[PDB]
PDB file of C-alpha atoms in Angstrom:
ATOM      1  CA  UNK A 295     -38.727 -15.615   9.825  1.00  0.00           C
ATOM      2  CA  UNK A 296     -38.232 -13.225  12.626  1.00  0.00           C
ATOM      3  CA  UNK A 297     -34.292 -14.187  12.176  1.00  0.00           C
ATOM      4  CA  UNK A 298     -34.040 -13.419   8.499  1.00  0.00           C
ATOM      5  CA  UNK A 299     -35.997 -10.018   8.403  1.00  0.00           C
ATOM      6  CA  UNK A 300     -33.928  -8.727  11.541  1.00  0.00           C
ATOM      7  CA  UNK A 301     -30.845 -10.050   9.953  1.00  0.00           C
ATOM      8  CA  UNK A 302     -32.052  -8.203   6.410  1.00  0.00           C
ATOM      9  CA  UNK A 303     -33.150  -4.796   8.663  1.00  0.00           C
ATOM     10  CA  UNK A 304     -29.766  -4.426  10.151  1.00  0.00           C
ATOM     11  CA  UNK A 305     -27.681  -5.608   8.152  1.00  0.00           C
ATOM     12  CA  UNK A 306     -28.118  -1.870   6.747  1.00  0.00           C
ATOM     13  CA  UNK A 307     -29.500  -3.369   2.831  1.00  0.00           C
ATOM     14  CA  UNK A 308     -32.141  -3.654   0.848  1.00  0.00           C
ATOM     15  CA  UNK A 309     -33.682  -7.208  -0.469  1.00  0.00           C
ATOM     16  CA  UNK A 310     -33.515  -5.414  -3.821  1.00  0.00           C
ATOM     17  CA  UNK A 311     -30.144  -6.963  -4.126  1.00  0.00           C
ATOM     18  CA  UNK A 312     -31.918 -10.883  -4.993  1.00  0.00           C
ATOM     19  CA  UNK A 313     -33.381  -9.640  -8.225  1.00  0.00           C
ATOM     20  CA  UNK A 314     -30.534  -8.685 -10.600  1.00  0.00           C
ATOM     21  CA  UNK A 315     -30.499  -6.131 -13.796  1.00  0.00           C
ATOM     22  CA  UNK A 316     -26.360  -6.438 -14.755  1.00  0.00           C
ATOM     23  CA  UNK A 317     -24.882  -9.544 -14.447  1.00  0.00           C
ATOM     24  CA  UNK A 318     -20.484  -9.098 -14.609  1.00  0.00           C
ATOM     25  CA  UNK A 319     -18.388 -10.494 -16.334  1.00  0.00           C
ATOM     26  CA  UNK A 320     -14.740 -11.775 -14.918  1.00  0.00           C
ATOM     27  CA  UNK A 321     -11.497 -10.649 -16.899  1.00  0.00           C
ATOM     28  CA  UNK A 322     -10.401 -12.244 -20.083  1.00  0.00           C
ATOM     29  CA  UNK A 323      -7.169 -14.098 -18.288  1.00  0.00           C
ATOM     30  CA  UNK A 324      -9.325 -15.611 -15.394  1.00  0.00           C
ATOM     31  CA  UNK A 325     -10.827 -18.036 -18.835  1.00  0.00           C
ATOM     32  CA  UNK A 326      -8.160 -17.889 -20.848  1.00  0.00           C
ATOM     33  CA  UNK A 327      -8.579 -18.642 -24.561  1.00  0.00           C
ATOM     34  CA  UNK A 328      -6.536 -21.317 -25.607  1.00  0.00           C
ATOM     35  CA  UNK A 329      -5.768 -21.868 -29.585  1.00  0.00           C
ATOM     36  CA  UNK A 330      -4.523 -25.528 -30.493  1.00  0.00           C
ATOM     37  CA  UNK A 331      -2.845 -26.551 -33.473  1.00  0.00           C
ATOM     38  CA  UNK A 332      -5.633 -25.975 -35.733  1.00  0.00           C
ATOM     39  CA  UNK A 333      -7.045 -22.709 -33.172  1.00  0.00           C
ATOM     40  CA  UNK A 334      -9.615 -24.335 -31.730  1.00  0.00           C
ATOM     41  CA  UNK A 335     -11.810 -23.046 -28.942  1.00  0.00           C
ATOM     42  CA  UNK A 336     -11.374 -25.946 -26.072  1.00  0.00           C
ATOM     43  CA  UNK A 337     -10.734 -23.385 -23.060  1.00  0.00           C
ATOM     44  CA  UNK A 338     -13.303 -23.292 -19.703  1.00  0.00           C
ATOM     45  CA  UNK A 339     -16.567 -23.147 -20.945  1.00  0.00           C
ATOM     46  CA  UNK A 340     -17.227 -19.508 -19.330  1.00  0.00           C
ATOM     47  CA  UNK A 341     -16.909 -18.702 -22.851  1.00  0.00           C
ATOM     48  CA  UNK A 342     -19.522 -20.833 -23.858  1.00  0.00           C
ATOM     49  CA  UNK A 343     -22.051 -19.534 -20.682  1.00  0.00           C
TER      50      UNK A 343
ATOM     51  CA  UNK B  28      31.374 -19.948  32.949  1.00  0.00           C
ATOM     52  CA  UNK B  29      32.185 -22.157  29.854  1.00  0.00           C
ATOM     53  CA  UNK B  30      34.070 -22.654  26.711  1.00  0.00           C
ATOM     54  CA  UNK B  31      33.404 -19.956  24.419  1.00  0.00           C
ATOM     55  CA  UNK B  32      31.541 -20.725  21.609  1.00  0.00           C
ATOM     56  CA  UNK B  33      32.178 -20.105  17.891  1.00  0.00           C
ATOM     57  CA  UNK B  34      29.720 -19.435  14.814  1.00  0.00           C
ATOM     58  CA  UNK B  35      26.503 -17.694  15.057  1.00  0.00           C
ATOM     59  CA  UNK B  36      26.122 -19.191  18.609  1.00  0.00           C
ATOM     60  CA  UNK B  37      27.864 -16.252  19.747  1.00  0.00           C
ATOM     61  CA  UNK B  38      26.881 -14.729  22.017  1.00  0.00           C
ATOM     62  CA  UNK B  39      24.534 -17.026  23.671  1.00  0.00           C
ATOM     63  CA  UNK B  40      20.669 -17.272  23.833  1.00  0.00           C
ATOM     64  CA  UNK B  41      20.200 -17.190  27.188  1.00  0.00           C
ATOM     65  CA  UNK B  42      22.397 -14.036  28.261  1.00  0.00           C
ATOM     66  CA  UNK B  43      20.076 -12.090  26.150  1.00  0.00           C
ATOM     67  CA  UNK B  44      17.215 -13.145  27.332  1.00  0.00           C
ATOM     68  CA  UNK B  45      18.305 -11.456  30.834  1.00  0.00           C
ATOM     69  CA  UNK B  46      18.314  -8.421  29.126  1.00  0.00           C
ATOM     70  CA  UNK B  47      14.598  -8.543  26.967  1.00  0.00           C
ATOM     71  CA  UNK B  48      11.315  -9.486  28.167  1.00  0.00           C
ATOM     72  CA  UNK B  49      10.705 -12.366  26.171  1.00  0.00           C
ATOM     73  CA  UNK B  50      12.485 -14.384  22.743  1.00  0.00           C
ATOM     74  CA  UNK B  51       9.420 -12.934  20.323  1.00  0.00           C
ATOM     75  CA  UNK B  52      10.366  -9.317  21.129  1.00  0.00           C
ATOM     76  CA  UNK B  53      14.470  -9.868  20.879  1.00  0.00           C
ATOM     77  CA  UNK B  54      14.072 -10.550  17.409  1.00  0.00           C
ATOM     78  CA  UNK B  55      12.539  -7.856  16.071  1.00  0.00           C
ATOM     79  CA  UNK B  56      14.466  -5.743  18.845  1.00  0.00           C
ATOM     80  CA  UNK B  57      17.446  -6.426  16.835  1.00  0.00           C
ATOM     81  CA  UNK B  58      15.999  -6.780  13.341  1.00  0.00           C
ATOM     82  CA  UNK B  59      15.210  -2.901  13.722  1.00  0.00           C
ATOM     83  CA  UNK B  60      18.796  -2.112  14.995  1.00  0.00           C
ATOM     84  CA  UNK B  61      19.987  -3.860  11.789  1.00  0.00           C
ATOM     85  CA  UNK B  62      18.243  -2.076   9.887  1.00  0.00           C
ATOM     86  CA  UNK B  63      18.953   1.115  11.078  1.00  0.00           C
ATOM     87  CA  UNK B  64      22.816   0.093  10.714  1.00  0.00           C
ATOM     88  CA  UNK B  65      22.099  -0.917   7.351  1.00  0.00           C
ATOM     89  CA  UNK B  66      20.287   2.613   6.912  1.00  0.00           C
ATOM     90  CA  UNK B  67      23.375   4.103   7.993  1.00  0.00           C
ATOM     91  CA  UNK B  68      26.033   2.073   5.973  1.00  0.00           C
ATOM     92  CA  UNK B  69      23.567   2.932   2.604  1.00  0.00           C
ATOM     93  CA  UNK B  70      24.085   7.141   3.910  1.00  0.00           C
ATOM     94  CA  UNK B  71      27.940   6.922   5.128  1.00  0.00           C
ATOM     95  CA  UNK B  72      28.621   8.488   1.612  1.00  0.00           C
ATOM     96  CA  UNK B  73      26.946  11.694   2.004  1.00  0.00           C
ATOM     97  CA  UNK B  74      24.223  12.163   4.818  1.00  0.00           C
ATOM     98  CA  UNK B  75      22.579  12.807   8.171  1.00  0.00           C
ATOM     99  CA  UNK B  76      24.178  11.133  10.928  1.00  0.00           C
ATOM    100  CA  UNK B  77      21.266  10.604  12.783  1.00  0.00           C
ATOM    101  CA  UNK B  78      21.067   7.103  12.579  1.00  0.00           C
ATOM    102  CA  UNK B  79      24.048   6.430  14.396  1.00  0.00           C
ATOM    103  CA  UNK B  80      26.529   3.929  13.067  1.00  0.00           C
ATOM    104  CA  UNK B  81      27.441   1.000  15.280  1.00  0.00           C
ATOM    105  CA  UNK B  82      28.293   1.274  19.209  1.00  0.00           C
ATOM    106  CA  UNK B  83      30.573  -1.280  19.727  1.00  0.00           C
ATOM    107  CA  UNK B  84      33.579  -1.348  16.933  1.00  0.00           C
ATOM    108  CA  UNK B  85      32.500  -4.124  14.452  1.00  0.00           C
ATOM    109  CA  UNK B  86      34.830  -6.891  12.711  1.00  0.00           C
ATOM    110  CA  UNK B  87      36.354  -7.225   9.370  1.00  0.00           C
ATOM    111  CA  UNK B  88      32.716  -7.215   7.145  1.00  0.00           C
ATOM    112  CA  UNK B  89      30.361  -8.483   9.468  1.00  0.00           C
ATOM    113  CA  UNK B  90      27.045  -8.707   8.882  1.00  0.00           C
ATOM    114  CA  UNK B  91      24.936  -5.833  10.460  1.00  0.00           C
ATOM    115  CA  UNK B  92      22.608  -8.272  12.582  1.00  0.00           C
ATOM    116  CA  UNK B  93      25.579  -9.767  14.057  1.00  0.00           C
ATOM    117  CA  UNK B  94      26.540  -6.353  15.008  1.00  0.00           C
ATOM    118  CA  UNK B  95      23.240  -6.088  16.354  1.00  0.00           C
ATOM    119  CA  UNK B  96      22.983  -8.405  18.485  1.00  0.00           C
ATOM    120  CA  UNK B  97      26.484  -8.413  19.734  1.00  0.00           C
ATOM    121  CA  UNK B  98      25.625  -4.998  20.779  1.00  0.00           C
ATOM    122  CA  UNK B  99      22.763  -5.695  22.227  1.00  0.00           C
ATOM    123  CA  UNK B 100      24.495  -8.084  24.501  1.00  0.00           C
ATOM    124  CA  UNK B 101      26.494  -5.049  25.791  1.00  0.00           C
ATOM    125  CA  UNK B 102      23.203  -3.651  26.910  1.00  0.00           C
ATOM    126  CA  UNK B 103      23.759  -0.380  24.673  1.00  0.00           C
ATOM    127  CA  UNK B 104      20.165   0.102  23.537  1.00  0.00           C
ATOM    128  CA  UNK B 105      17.100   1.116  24.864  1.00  0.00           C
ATOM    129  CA  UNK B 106      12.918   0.344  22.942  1.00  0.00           C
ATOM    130  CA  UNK B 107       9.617   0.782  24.221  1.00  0.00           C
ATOM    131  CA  UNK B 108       7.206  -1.821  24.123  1.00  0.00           C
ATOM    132  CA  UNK B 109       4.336  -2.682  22.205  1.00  0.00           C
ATOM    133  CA  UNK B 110       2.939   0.826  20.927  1.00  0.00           C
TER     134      UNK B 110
ATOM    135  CA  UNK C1078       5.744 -14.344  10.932  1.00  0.00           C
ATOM    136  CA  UNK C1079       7.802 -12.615   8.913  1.00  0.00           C
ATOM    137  CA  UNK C1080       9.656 -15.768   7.563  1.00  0.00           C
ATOM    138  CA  UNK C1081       5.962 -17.163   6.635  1.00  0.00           C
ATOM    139  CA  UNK C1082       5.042 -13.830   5.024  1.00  0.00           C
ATOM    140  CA  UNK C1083       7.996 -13.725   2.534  1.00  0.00           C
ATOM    141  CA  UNK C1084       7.661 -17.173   1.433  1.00  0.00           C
ATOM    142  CA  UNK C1085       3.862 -17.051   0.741  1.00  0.00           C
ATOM    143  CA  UNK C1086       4.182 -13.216  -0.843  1.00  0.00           C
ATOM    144  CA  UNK C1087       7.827 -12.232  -1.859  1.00  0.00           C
ATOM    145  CA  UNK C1088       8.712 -14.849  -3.294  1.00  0.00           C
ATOM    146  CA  UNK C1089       6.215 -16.667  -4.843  1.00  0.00           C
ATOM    147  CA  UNK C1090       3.157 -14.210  -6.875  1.00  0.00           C
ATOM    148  CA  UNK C1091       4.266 -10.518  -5.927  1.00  0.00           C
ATOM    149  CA  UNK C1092       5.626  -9.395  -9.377  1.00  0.00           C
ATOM    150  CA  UNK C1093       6.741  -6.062  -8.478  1.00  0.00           C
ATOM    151  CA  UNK C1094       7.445  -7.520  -4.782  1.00  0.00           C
ATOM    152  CA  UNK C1095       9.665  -9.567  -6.996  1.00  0.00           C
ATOM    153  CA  UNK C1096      11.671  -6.491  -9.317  1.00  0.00           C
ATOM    154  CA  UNK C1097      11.813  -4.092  -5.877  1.00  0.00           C
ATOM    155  CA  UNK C1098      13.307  -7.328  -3.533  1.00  0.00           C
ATOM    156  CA  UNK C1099      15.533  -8.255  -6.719  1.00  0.00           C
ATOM    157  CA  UNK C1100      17.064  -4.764  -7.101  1.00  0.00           C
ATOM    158  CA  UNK C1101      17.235  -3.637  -3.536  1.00  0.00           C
ATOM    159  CA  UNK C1102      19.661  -6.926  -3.420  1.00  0.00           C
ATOM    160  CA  UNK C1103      21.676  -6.110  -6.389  1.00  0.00           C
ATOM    161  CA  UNK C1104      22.188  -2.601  -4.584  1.00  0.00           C
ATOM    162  CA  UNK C1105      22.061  -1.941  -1.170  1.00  0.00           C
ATOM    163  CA  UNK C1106      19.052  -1.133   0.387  1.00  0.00           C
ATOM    164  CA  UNK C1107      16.924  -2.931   2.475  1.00  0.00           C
ATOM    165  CA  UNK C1108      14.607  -5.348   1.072  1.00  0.00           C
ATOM    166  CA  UNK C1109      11.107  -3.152   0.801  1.00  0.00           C
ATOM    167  CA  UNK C1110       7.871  -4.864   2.546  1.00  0.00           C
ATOM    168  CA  UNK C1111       5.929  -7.572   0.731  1.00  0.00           C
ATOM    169  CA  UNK C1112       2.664  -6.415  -0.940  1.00  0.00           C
ATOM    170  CA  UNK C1113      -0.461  -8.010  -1.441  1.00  0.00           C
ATOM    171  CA  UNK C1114      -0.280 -11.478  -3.361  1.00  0.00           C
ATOM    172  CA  UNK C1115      -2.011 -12.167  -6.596  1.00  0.00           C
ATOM    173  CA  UNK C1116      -3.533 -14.977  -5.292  1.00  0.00           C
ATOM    174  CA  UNK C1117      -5.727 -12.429  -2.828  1.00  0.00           C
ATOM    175  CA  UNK C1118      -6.186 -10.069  -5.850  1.00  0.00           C
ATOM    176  CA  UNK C1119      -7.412 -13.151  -7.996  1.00  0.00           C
ATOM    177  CA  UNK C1120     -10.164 -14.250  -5.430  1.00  0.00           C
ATOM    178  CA  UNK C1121     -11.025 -10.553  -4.977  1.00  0.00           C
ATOM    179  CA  UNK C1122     -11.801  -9.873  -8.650  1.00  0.00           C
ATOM    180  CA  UNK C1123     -13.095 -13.043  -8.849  1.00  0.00           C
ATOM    181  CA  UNK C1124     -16.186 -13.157  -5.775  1.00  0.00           C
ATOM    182  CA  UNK C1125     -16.560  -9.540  -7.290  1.00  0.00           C
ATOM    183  CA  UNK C1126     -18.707 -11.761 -10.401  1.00  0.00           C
TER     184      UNK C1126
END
């Protein structure tokens, strides 16, 4: 325990940072939308999360 | 004290490694050489000569490493070492 | 080094690494330094989310 907390105190931070408010969201390209011969939606799933 | 050579080969490895410290530094001893020739060459239109064309005549369209390093050989240039 | 760097940069991703080493061939002027690959840009923008 001693580890972690002197590792979180200099490391200069806040713990604040393990409870997220904004998730992001990567670029369009990075899952690219593929249309097939009747436009379906079978790209990577990051679409679908 | 042999043949001479013909190609690239010439002149030799080892007679320039009399003259620099060690193989890693020749190259880039000579890269920046050519590329100051090659500065020049791009300037002989209309310029500053301060980048002073090639010391030892050159051949009939010879590449400006070759020039270089057949300078180089003559023992025509002078660098400081790392920083 | 140098070798190493062109093949995994130049020559490869770089797209304007690519136009610049392209034209400075077509004309005369030294080939201009490698730039960062988009591979490295990709993972950036990518550990970013």
């Amino acid at each position: 325990r001693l580890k972690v907390v002197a590792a979180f105190q200099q490391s200069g931070n806040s713990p604040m940072g393990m409870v997220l408010d904004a998730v992001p969201v990567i670029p369009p390209e990075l899952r690219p939308m593929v249309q097939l011969d009747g436009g379906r939606f079978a790209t990577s799933d990051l679409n679908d999360l | 004290g042999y043949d001479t050579p013909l190609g690239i080969t010439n002149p030799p490895i080892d007679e320039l490694l009399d003259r620099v410290s060690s193989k890693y530094a020749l190259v880039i001893y000579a890269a920046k050489r050519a590329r100051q020739i090659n500065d020049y060459y791009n300037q002989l239109g209309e310029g500053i000569l301060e980048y002073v064309g090639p010391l030892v005549e050159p051949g009939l369209q010879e590449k400006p490493l070759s020039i270089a390093l057949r300078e180089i050989h003559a023992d025509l240039l002078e660098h400081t070492e790392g920083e | 080094a140098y070798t190493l760097q062109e093949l995994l940069t130049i020559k490869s991703d770089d797209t304007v690494g690519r136009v610049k080493v392209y034209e400075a061939i077509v004309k005369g002027e030294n080939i201009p330094e490698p730039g960062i690959p988009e591979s490295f840009k990709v993972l950036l923008k990518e550990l970013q989310s």
